[PDB]
Design a protein around this ligand. Structure first.
Ligand code: THP
Ligand code: CA
Length: 129
């Protein structure tokens, strides 16, 4: 996999964000995770965590996996990095997302993220509290 540039356009929620990619506005949905909807418990906290991470970043990058790059709603599917740190993983490590939606052929970082989820659960963080 490789990292490609993007710039933040706007926060959306815990697991989606509006980015400019190859000069076009797209909504991105984070691979391999599910944050609570803003209406649900820890939704606000997930949104805020995601928003802060991306807005504090100097450099946002997107990394597509081997499979589908857009989902059925036209959202980009990617691992998103904020100054080299993977947002998807950070959400799971903080107990603000579950590993989820692991479809074969776009699951390169599955085991990395499950390792994070296990550490979050052990610490009883947020969703695992
Ligand atoms: C994360 C992800 C979600 N999706 C689709 C599956 C779910 O369809 P449904 O809308 O029919 O439930 C939905 C979950 O996204 P959200 O969690 O953002 O709702 O997005 C994919 O197709 N590929 C993916 O990699
Ligand atoms: Ca969600």
């Amino acid at each position: 996999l490789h990292k490609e540039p993007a710039t933040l356009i706007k926060a959306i929620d815990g697991d989606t964000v509006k980015l400019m990619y190859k000069g076009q506005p797209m909504t991105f949905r984070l691979l391999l995770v599910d944050t609570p909807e803003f209406n649900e418990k820890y939704g606000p906290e997930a949104s805020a965590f995601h928003k802060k991470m991306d807005q504090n970043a100097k450099k946002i990058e997107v990394e597509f996996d081997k499979g589908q790059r857009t989902d059925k709603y036209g959202r980009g599917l990617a691992y998103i990095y904020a100054d080299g740190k993977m947002v998807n993983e950070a959400l799971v490590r903080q107990g603000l997302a579950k590993v989820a939606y692991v479809y074969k052929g776009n699951n390169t970082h599955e085991q990395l993220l499950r390792k994070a989820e296990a550490q979050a659960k052990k610490e009883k963080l947020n969703i695992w509290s």
